[PDB]
Design a protein around this ligand. Structure first.
Ligand SMILES: [Cl-]
Ligand SMILES: [Cl-]
Ligand SMILES: [Zn+2]
Ligand SMILES: [Zn+2]
Lengths: 21, 30, 30, 21, 30, 21, 30, 21, 30, 21, 30, 21
């Protein structure tokens, strides 16, 4: 999930958009 | 841009930034 | 708890604290 | 909505809780 | 609601949220 | 203290009210 | 240091940074 | 008070220091 | 990404997220 | 400047990127 | 005042606080 | 750098002024 993607690993701003509505 | 560790409230701050008006979901359980 | 006046990212912060591991959705008008 | 209400008026943690998953 | 780890500035943000107008004390030495 | 209660361990929002005035 | 214009949670943040391990009290009017 | 002054006017870290424990 | 309305520390936060390890400069008018 | 523009008007992450090092 | 660990966005928040109008640079690579 | 000074180690508010413009 986002936490694994972005906190555990790293993610880009672009990846963070995956979680927009 | 870059890739950092974004955890907790900082993650949701980033989501707010990226998404803004669109809104987002923060769903840690997945 | 007290009533809250929360704009912008402060709302997302408050949602984060209130929801925790449940997460949340942020859905502004739009 | 909750986003507009919390900012233009006030809102409660109890109202904010309705947006939890 | 939930239980999370609240440290540092995030703790005091949470206290601000919970207490607001009442105010609070943040006294880490105890 | 609050740090042991809430940072070291976990605490609820209700527990955090213990530290309001 | 510079003069500060600090509302809401930003004050609690500034107090947190300024006081550190001493902690602080946040006492608004109310 | 300090909360109102910092928000409606300005304040200094030196004034904020008076609220430390 | 969406357009941003960012005052005070919220700008520094947004710069931090956008720049990451590159860092940034914050240069207000003043 | 960017600080004033983001606050009084709006700005983009793409504009904010110009201030990265 | 005090000495704390200031990392990440919290560092840049502190820099914003300390420097304000003067502005600052956040340059983690050094 | 600032990160070593202030995050890795600890630094004062006064030290943080080293990074003002
Ligand atoms: Cl943190
Ligand atoms: Cl604000
Ligand atoms: Zn943090
Ligand atoms: Zn704010």
């Amino acid at each position: 999930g986002i936490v694994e993607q972005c906190c555990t690993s790293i993610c880009s701003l672009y990846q963070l958009e995956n979680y927009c509505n | 841009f870059v890739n950092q560790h974004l955890c907790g409230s900082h993650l949701v701050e980033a989501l707010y930034l990226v998404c803004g008006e669109r809104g987002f979901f923060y769903t840690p359980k997945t």
